[PDB]
Design a binder for these strands. Sequence first.
RNA 1: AAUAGGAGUAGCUUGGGGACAUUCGUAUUCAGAUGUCAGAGGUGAAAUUCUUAGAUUUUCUGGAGACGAACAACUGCGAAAGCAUUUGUCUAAAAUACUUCCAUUAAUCAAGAACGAAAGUUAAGGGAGUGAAGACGAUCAGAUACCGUCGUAAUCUUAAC
RNA 2: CAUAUUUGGUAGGACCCGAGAGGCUUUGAACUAAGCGUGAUGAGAUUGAAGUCAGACGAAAGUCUGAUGGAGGAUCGAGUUGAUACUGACGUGCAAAUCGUUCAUUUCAAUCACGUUUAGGGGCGAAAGACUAAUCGAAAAGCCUAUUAGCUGGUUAUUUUCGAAAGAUCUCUCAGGAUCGCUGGAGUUGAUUAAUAUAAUUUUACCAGGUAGAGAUAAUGAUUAGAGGACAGGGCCUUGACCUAU
RNA 3: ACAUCUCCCUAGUGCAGAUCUUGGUGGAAGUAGCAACUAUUCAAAUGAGAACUUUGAAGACUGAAGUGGAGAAGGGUUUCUUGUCAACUGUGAUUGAACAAGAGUUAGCCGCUCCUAAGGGAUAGCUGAAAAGUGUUUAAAGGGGUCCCCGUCUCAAAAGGGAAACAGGUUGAUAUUCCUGUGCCAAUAGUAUUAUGAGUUAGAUGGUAACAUAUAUAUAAAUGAACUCCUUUACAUAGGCUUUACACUCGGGGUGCGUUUUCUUUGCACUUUACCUUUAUAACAAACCUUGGAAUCAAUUUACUUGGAGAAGAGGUUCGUUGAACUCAAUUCAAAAAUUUGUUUUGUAGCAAUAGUAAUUCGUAAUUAUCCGAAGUGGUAAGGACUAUCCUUGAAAAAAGGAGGGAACGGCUUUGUGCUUUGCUACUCUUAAUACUUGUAUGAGCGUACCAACAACCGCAUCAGGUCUCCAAGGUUAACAGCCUCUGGUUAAAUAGAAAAAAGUAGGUAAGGGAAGUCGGCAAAAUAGAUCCGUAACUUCGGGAAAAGGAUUGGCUCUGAGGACAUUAAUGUUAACUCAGAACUGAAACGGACAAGGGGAAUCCGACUGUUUAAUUAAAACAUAGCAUUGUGAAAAGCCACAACUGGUAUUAACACAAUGUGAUUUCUGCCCAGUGCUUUGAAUGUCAACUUGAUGAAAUUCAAUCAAGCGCAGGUAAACGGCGGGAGUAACUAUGACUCUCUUAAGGUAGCCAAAUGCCUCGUCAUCUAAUUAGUGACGCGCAUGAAUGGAUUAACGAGAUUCCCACUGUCCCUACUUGCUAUCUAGCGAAACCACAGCCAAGGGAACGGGCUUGGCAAAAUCAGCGGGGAAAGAAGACCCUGUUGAGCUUUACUCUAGUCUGGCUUUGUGAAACGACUUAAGAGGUGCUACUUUUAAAGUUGUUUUACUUAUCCAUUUAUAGGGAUGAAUUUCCCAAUAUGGAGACAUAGCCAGGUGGGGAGUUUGACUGGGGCGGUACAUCUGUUAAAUAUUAACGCAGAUGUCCAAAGACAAGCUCAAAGAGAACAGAAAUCUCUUGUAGACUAAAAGGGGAAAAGCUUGUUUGAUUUCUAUUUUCAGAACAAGUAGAAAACGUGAAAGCGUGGCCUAUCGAUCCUUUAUAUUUGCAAAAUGACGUAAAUUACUUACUACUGUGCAUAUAGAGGUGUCUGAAAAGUUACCACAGGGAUAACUGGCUUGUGGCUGCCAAGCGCUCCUAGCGACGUAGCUUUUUGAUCCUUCGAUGUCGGCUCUUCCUAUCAUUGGGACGCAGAAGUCUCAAAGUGUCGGAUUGUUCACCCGCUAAUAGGGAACGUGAGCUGGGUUUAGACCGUCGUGAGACAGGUUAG
Length: 247
Amino acid sequence: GRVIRGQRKGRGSIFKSHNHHRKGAAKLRHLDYCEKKGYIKGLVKDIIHDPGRGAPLAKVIFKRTEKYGKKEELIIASEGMFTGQYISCGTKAPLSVGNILPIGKMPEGTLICNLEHRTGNRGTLVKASGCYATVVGQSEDGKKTKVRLPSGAKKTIDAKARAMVGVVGAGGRIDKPILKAGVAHHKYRVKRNCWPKVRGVAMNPVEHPHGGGNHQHIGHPSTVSRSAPAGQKVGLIAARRTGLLRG
RNA sequence: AAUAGGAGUAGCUUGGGGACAUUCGUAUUCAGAUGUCAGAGGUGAAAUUCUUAGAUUUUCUGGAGACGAACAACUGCGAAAGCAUUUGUCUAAAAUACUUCCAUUAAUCAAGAACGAAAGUUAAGGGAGUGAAGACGAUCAGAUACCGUCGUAAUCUUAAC
RNA sequence: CAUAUUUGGUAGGACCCGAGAGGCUUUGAACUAAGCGUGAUGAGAUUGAAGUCAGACGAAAGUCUGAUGGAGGAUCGAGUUGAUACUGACGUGCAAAUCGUUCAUUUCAAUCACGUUUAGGGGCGAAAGACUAAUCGAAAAGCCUAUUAGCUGGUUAUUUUCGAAAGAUCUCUCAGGAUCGCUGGAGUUGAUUAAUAUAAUUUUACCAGGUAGAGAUAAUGAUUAGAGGACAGGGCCUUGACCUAU
RNA sequence: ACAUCUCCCUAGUGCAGAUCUUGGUGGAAGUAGCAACUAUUCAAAUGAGAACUUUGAAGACUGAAGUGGAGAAGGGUUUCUUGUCAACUGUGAUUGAACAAGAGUUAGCCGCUCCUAAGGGAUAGCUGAAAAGUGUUUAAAGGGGUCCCCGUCUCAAAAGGGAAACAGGUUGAUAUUCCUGUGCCAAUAGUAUUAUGAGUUAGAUGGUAACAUAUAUAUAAAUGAACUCCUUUACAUAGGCUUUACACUCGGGGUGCGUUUUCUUUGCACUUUACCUUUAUAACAAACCUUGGAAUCAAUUUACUUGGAGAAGAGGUUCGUUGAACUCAAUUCAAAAAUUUGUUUUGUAGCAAUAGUAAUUCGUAAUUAUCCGAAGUGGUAAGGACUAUCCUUGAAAAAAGGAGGGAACGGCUUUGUGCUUUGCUACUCUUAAUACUUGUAUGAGCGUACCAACAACCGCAUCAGGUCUCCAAGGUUAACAGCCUCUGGUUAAAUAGAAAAAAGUAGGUAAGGGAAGUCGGCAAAAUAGAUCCGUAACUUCGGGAAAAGGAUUGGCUCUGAGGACAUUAAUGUUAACUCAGAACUGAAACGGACAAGGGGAAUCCGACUGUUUAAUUAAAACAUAGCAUUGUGAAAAGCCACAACUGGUAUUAACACAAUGUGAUUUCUGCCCAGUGCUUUGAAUGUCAACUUGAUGAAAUUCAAUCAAGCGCAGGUAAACGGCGGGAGUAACUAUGACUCUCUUAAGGUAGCCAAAUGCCUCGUCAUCUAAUUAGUGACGCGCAUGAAUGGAUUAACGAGAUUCCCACUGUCCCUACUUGCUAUCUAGCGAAACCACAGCCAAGGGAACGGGCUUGGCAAAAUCAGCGGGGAAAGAAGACCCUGUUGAGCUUUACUCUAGUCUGGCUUUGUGAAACGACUUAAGAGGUGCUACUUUUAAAGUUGUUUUACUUAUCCAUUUAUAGGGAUGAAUUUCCCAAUAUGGAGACAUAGCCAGGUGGGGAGUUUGACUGGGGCGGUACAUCUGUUAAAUAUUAACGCAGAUGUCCAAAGACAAGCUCAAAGAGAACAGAAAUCUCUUGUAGACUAAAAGGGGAAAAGCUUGUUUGAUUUCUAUUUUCAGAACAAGUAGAAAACGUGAAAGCGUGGCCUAUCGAUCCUUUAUAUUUGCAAAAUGACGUAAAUUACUUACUACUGUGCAUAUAGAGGUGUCUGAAAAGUUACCACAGGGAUAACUGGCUUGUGGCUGCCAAGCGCUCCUAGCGACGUAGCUUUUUGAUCCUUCGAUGUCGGCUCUUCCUAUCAUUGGGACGCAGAAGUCUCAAAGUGUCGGAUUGUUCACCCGCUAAUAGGGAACGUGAGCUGGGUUUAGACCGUCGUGAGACAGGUUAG
């Protein structure tokens, strides 16, 4: 046929991210001597909204460590933090909400966010609204630490990786149902052109593997192999099992 | 100043009364190790089941939910439903004692209201064990049952009913 | 052997005209599609969500009544944006989609402008194989290319002479081809001696036949009747079978 | 200029045709036609000539959503004046957007020009043959300060940001642009003078505060560096409220004009004021401050907001609106201070009247007079203060400004090395002017006409089409609607007049009936505005709802209700429009025009609003929220793009991203993992590639062996694809079967549901609706073939949806009639085309089977005019249906062949060590065997292969401005201990390179027999063999007939010998019909491998003996036939044998069937050959000498190849390696070939006979009539395939006419089982007639009703340039069954 709808989405034309009103990337204060050997205290001056994600962004001011005057970063906000709060970052920073600490210095069973998947990477796991990770353990020789990502996997990271004490802001976002189509339109309008979806089975054959027939029947298995080639990947990708959940 | 009533005051008064935080124990189970070697589970009898890719069994680590025995009674508290690990915090409660205060403030109550086991419902988590449904193996003239093996929903917390 | 011409055969454009395509390289997003940026735009009405105030009731919890209020991809509606119905007008049009009347749409999944993004087995698609400049189940342009066609049409002065076939075998063969048959030309040989060769002929000899016919009492198969006799059931007798001549 | 025929060379050499090409031209024809957009008339001028040039007068229209002003894109001199008429200006034309000749566009301020956005193009790298693809991914890169700090370049807005301009006047054509006035903005160098004010003896003051302060021709001037920190620039949507401006209106004064018979203190016009002056002030919403200290809370807005974190009150300060408001300023006099308050006069506040406008006079340019006192409506626009909405929070920079910070700091004279010490006091700022030098020392370049559609654009053009923005008057009014009017514009459209008919088309209107019409209430009509009442089922409680259903409504004349101000409760001045009530009045009418809901009762589908097939389908399709599912923890991942490097999702991170299914709510979501998918474990495990490793060999080779994934083996999975049974028997009647038996499945349809868009049978059965019901609805449900996210069931709301009924209503219909505009018509003017072999009266006949011409008849008389649709198998256009092609294409798959990707192993890149493991080599013991060979253990020897690990320098990822060596909601700038590759991370694994296996409709290329009484299905008649058809040689056909073939056989072959069989009779213990035995009779009735036919008795049969000729080689030939091939034979020959005594006979089967080219492989054969300059037995045998010696020998390495001979197979059998689909389709053809008529025939249907056994009470025939038998007919259905495939428009209804008779009625008769009556059969009869409906797409059918009877037929199945389009037969769609799929359906249903 021709290039299928899934393939077209990737290809860097019109489907590029809806940039225009985004306020710039959220990534933690980069690693330095002052943080590594101690603590630096900063000021949250403002909390600002973001067209991409449910969590609000937090406007954080530091005073520079080798030049005069104040420099501004954008941190992703923990729930329960506030404008005019002092935010502290570093190895000696105290365990308190919205501070930024190495995971090696957590007491067990703390709830955290902004994990760096490997050290110094400025935060890359646990950023969506209402998520958290839990610290589950410290090895006897130290150096590594064991954490739990909110999907349900357990993961082991280096101890000196950063995280932020407290749950990610804007919790419960998908509790509220989207009542009408226009609200869904507005949700996708600030994200990515990906919607309305269009059922693949209703397409002509030329456009998609489910297409054709006279009852909109799938007509062959809905589970396709991990090994499947590019245009073939159709319904339930590489699935372990199908039908309703148990645990 | 009612062996009426309410209120007060007092005691290292009382108690598995309520709530929240908190903490520990054990089995069971999962995972990770460990050593073994043929059967192990299962029963009125057995089979379905699980097992040489090492089951069952041995001991250890880590995880997980559940429950909180024994002590425990012709015992305690709660309006009743109900309530049993540790400590803390917030709460109520009754009796006693009282040369303390108020002075009939009461009794029962259609209307109306608060709470209201268990199951069930709705929603999020959660999901060990148990286990309507269901699936088989048996038992029986027959068995949609009793018995057996597995096994969803429910059982647990939060938020509603 | 060389060479002249001829015809046939074979390759090429190869008797002339004719696809549907396939490949190669480019050119289009002024329409239109979707995305984006900067911007514009939507007469007038109607309903009357939350909150608020006042009144009323009740011991309580609570509940009612009147205002106020101004919510909603709410309602009707010009415009605007559409195209439902009239199978109305026109249908050698006013137009290669127009006209009249009717109708759907109007603060949002809204409409428009301009700028901008994505390009051909590609783009784009709230998905019709829709759309990508009157061109789309594979755009437009030129070239490979006079592509190729067992198929259709056409295929040009005269007189004269001879003149067919529509059988046959083989064929991924049944609209074709090959190859035999049947035809013309060229030539030699022979006849040219009322001849021998010879003949779609008869004759006299001599064979070979199993069709029309004819037969059932000749065989095989059918097939309708009785007559006369020496193996079976019942009570010399009955049904027969079975013979024999019919 | 031309011949050549004397002879002969040479060729792009001879046309009617090709839907030929090109150019020209007719009939059609003075015809079709010149129809939108309300509509013109009279007089005059110009001119040769005026319906459409100009002018006046009328009458009209556009009607501020305009043919009005401006502008954008595009056009491009279209503008203007002057000419002017060859062509054009579809009529005319003196006109003109035509033609000709000149002419016209003026900017510091309006734009562009500058900035950045979505984005573009480049630089660094890196890829790539290059072309190009990428845009910091290994940058020594553009600037600012004065050695330090910033830091990709560049383009991208004529509607975002944006230095500054307005008024009046003026030209034939421009004007925010020229002219006049007034300003504003930006520059404005150095040096020296001057003048302006500041500060000083290096930085002013006030104010409690919020904050204020420079008024100089000019508000100029209030120190400030590095470095910083802000802010303005700069932003959504909704809703109301409020303020100002403009607009509109009213009243009064003043001017002019108008009506002025009658009325009219009148109707109308005019009554002007810009930028600019931080505009001066006032006013007002806020904000903020000082005081003040608040509950019986207060203040307070339309709205709610606000307060001990300080409210009210009282006094202030500021911004923003505004832009002369306010006694504002100036002035005056009265009362003040060593410069105020009170009173007066001025000024359109300056700009400003000199400028405008309306007037009025005189010259023929000059004067005069006017220019202003009150107020309302709220239509526009801006602002202000706000409130609410969002799983949406609503650009950026250029540019400018403010602050923090505190670097730097008299002038002159002078010793000494910018510094130090001495002497002296106007110095430092700062505007503006001036002079001089310095290149010439003030304002760059580009745009500016006109149209902007009605004729300037695009649409082939002066095309009723399309095309962006602003401006918005009066009345009516909810109203920017519709109607009419003012300003402004027009009175022209590709023509006019006259006539007035059919027909057409855009309209009206109809008595009585009221859907009877029609597939269908389509069309048309009815309704409608408002106020006041009244408002159901049902409902997700929100709605349904304007439900339904009523009433009222004019004009006049009154009444009541609703405010604002200011006087000292009363008294006064004073504003709107909206409401409510009462009289009187009239042809009972009054939302009067315009505007403007039909409603109800139900079913089906879709929840909804949304969206879609541009130019046939708006929907039930699609989307949607919710539900449900799946992958993925990250740059060595998911998902996806790219040749490659590299990207995108990602400015991201599981409440995410990606991929699907389903489709609001409510209620539910059963069963099955066998089949196919998908998926999880592995060195026990079968297979499974390269490499490796060993063994063998002279080597090539040849052999083995090893832990890849994959599959297999073991599980998991159905909101994965999907799937979800059959018979019997059984209850006091019968019935049914709870109940039982039974075969069987992976499991056997549960909850539900229904003749539903799902039901074939089927118009199902029963109700009900109706008068009549294939329709509607409710039931019932052994259901061709319902059913649970492929969703089941129900649903309020919603629908340009599908369907039915009921009410209202009507010309839909009875049944049509009248009427109006515009056409048609005639004329003047202008003026095409399709089409066209030739043509054009018929009947019949024949003929390629329906002729205009042909034969025989009828017949046949110019020229014309208007209609019309019978025919011209009328036109269009190489049938789209069907078939055909060794033409295609789209699409699908477990078709054949592949392939990007992906997964996995190996080798490399790939270093450094450590340890463990194994193998191999060399030595010793134990076990078995025949000085030798084999098996098992031991060396822990050497060498080598492997698994685990440590290291980092290779390599890879991340990070930053590459920013301190490791341990113990202010401001912030000029320790101690240990040590002596930017930082982490990962790391010889990746990755990448090359091999190699798997996976691989994601994507590619291609194929997808033939015959064929259409094709497909079925079959094989495709290779063959018998008999028959075949017509007495031979020949010879059909999807003719009855059949057979793809083998079987060491004997069933070969030879000889012996014997005679089947059967029948008569006999013989057990013994019977069969058993064996015997005798007689026994020409074949047996047996002969197998079809069927031939042949066979001292055999060809049966029994027995001996055997292998079922052999090798070669001919001549027969059959089919081309007299090719194979195959099967027949006759021999040369060998060798077998048997028989011997002749003989034996070269497969008693004869007729039993089957296979080339290449290739494979194994046989040989004293045959090759491997391309040579050799390989063998220095063999003799000699010979010491050597490059001489003779002489059929037999001479491995491997490969030949030649000859078999065998491996092509059954579509003289031999391609090959599946489906198209209702999305294309093209070449076909009447060689279907679906339609006509034609032949008439099986089938229909109609008529003849017989006479019977029936008819008795009685053949009154009426009948079996058993039988003969015809007719072409209204049926077939059979057929002659005609048409470069198109005969495919069902039915409507309408309309004619023909027929096989008569239904009517007329006349005859017969009777005929009493009358009723009637049956029958003859002349085609004159005349043959109906209203219900239901269905219907032919047909069935009712119901009328009737005189509701007869049968024909005419290309009469009737589509008459209609209609409901059905069938395009594209969309739904459901079932069927198909893995694409898709299929003589099944249904819907838009077409």
